[PDB]
UniProtKB/Swiss-Prot annotation:
Localization in the cell: Cytoplasm
Biological classification of the source: Bacteria, Pseudomonadati, Pseudomonadota, Gammaproteobacteria, Alteromonadales
Superkingdom of the organism of origin: Bacteria
NCBIfam families (alphabetical): PRK00203.1
Pfam families for the chain: RNase_H
UniProt organism field: Shewanella oneidensis (strain ATCC 700550 / JCM 31522 / CIP 106686 / LMG 19005 / NCIMB 14063 / MR-1)
Cofactor annotation remark: Binds 1 Mg(2+) ion per subunit. May bind a second metal ion at a regulatory site, or after substrate binding.
Gene: rnhA
Enzyme kind, highest EC tier: hydrolase
Function recorded in the entry: Endonuclease that specifically degrades the RNA of RNA-DNA hybrids.
Protein name (Swiss-Prot/TrEMBL): Ribonuclease HI
E.C. designation(s): 3.1.26.4
Entry binding sites for Mg(2+) 1: 9, 47, 69
Length: 155
């Protein structure tokens, strides 16, 4: 297991509005930056999609230290997903969980690695967490045209 340090952030101008994510990944001496934007999404979707894309890009199972700023994602990984699996990914109203498409992808991709999740304590991150924010905000501000096809209306 190679050691990868991953840093992620999502940003959205609006709720909903154009959004983006930023990812920095460091492996030994190397660094890779990744970002993308969407025309209409939410901050919460971009906060999930960042680690999803980072984790889905890894070619084989790794040991990872992944740092994000999102207490929404954290809540998911530490308590909601486990309950959701037992309830058929439905809420207590017996309807599908919000952003279920992304939560399922995150859960699936996370299972393949050994992950040490870290959450930026408001906000004394590493420089890389700044760099994510910059990349995310850049991509959201650049009049992105790509469609987030899992963002649902009223959402």
């Amino acid at each position: 297991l190679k050691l990868i340090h991953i840093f992620t952030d999502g940003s959205c101008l609006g709720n909903p509005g154009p959004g983006g994510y930023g990812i920095v990944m460091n492996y030994k001496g190397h660094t890779k930056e990744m970002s993308d934007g969407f025309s209409l999404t939410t901050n919460n979707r971009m906060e999930l999609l960042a680690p999803i894309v980072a984790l889905e890009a890894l070619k084989e199972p790794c040991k990872i230290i992944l740092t994000s700023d999102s207490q929404y994602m954290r809540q998911g990984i530490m308590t909601w997903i486990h309950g959701w699996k037992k309830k058929g990914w439905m809420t207590s109203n017996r309807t599908p969980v919000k952003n279920v498409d992304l939560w399922k992808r995150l859960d699936k991709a996370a299972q393949l690695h050994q992950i040490d999740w870290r959450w930026v304590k408001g906000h004394a991150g590493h420089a890389e967490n700044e760099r994510c924010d910059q990349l995310a905000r850049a991509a959201a501000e650049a009049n992105p045209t790509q469609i987030d096809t899992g963002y649902q209306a009223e959402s």
